[PDB]
Design a protein around this ligand. Structure first.
Ligand SMILES: CCCS(=O)(=O)Nc1ccc(F)c(NC(=O)c2csc3c(N)ncnc23)c1F
Ligand SMILES: CCCS(=O)(=O)Nc1ccc(F)c(NC(=O)c2csc3c(N)ncnc23)c1F
Lengths: 266, 276
């Protein structure tokens, strides 16, 4: 049972992650691992207690498209250990190196991503930050969705682009529904289908923020490339719906992504 | 938490597992899965209870080189559900479709297999049936070790699954195991021995004792120590450290066999001694 990983066992190496929420280092623990060290130095329950509970959510995940939670540290620091992934994140492929994907592959990344989310949701987990930076291309073929945990350890800016309007207008207590995630997905669809971040012709974040939340600005669905199937535009539009209850849930989304997939190379 | 998958959620499809201890099917449940259905025709509380225990073992595993356990069913029949791997088993590649692997790749397959084994052991689980059919090459480049699951349940239900799967792996059995000298011959080391055999498979592209068609004799001879894998068949470009590690691994005397942490060190060492 308990995934406590006693000190001395994990070797820490090369560094990668910034901000708060933690620092991420590439590690070694029965092979190459990833270690996200929260660096929130010396808790102190019930801060300690909260982390143990946050871990509880992670252990509920077992899926090819969800990042493999392997264990957590308490001693050296508070930390979570996951599988390490070769290749780069989708945000990197698309908007940093500009890897041009074949239309067939693009549809597939989407396919897997929806696959993973459907799972997350079926297991009552709201990601609350689905974006192409948290979608990893492992060996550049398999999709691993990460950073969906530790909402709560953050309860006790700059992924605005994926925020649904209800989320964006920091309005009520909990904007986060499955459909909040669906909308974010929509944005990532638009990402794949146009190899671009939305609203790139507006240089004023607050303006984006204001408009998105009011439904005056929305992503420009006509920047999809020609070899992109008509039905993809139809689904993007469905996930991107400003009223949340107009958005499909994932199983239904999944269905559309499959149906339209095996009408493409034929 | 608890992993029981409620009825009729899973979609069974292609039959793949022959086997008299139930069938492996390619399934669908949140994407492609593998479903192994025990089809010992309806328990019997509490075989059921012990079954659930066996999952306790499976849940303990969370490693890239261990076939991802995804959940279990009891509802229609008893079942274990895992990720579906694309690609084929190491058995299939070596012996059925005769894939010639790059020397670098082969050593890598060894490493991973060793890697996963190390972990498997570092969680006090003995495989008891390591062979190249239980080493799966997902996407042709990641080893997922499977079929180490329902140890006790298998060890203790009426049927010829108790027989077949012993016969099914005489080649990988350590001597200690071959001569049923007592109740428990199975060890970290017997696993190391079987691993030593897959090492042979990888380097020789062959099963051992390929020129001894009488299988009853194999059992006698190996148990007595008159027979062991012919290590002069290692393809001429195999690093000579790997040929030594092989020997080290296959030691007839169990306690001369190194354990995985150390094996892993050797494999990683001889890796660095090849491309550069
Ligand atoms: C099961 C996921 C738990 S979580 O907290 O929701 N996500 C989560 C937890 C710990 C991590 F190190 C990471 N990983 C990363 O941030 C990360 C950055 S690069 C990278 C990589 N090449 N392989 C694995 N993980 C990462 C997570 F994505
Ligand atoms: C760690 C998993 C539990 S276990 O009992 O050790 N192994 C185990 C349990 C249920 C399965 F369907 C399988 N899978 C198979 O037998 C199997 C045959 S082909 C195949 C494949 N392409 N991908 C996954 N699994 C399999 C297992 F290997």
């Amino acid at each position: 049972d308990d995934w406590e990983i006693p000190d001395g066992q994990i070797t820490v190496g090369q560094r990668i992650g910034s901000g708060s929420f933690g620092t991420v280092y590439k590690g070694k623990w029965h092979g190459d691992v990833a270690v996200k060290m929260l660096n929130v130095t010396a808790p102190t329950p019930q801060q300690l207690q909260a982390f143990k509970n946050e871990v509880g959510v992670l252990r509920k995940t077992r899926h090819v498209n969800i990042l493999l939670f392997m264990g957590y540290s308490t001693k050296p620091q508070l930390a979570i250990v996951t599988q390490w992934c070769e290749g780069s994140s989708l945000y990197h492929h698309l908007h940093i190196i500009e890897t041009k994907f074949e239309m067939i592959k693009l549809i597939d990344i989407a396919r897997q991503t929806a696959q993973g989310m459907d799972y997350l949701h079926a297991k009552s987990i709201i990601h609350r930050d689905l974006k192409s930076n948290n979608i990893f291309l492992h060996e550049d073929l398999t999709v691993k969705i990460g950073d969906f945990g530790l909402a709560t350890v953050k309860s006790r800016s700059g992924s605005i682009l994926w925020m649904a309007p209800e989320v964006i207008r920091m309005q009520d207590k909990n904007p986060y529904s499955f459909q909040s995630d669906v909308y974010a997905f929509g944005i990532v669809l638009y990402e794949l289908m146009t190899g671009q971040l939305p609203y790139s012709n507006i240089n004023n974040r607050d303006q984006i923020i204001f408009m998105v939340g009011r439904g005056y600005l929305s992503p420009d669905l006509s920047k999809v490339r020609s070899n992109c199937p008509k039905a993809m535009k139809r689904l993007m539009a469905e996930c991107l719906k400003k009223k949340r209850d107009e958005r499909p849930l994932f199983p239904q989304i999944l269905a559309s992504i499959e149906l339209l997939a095996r009408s493409l190379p034929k």
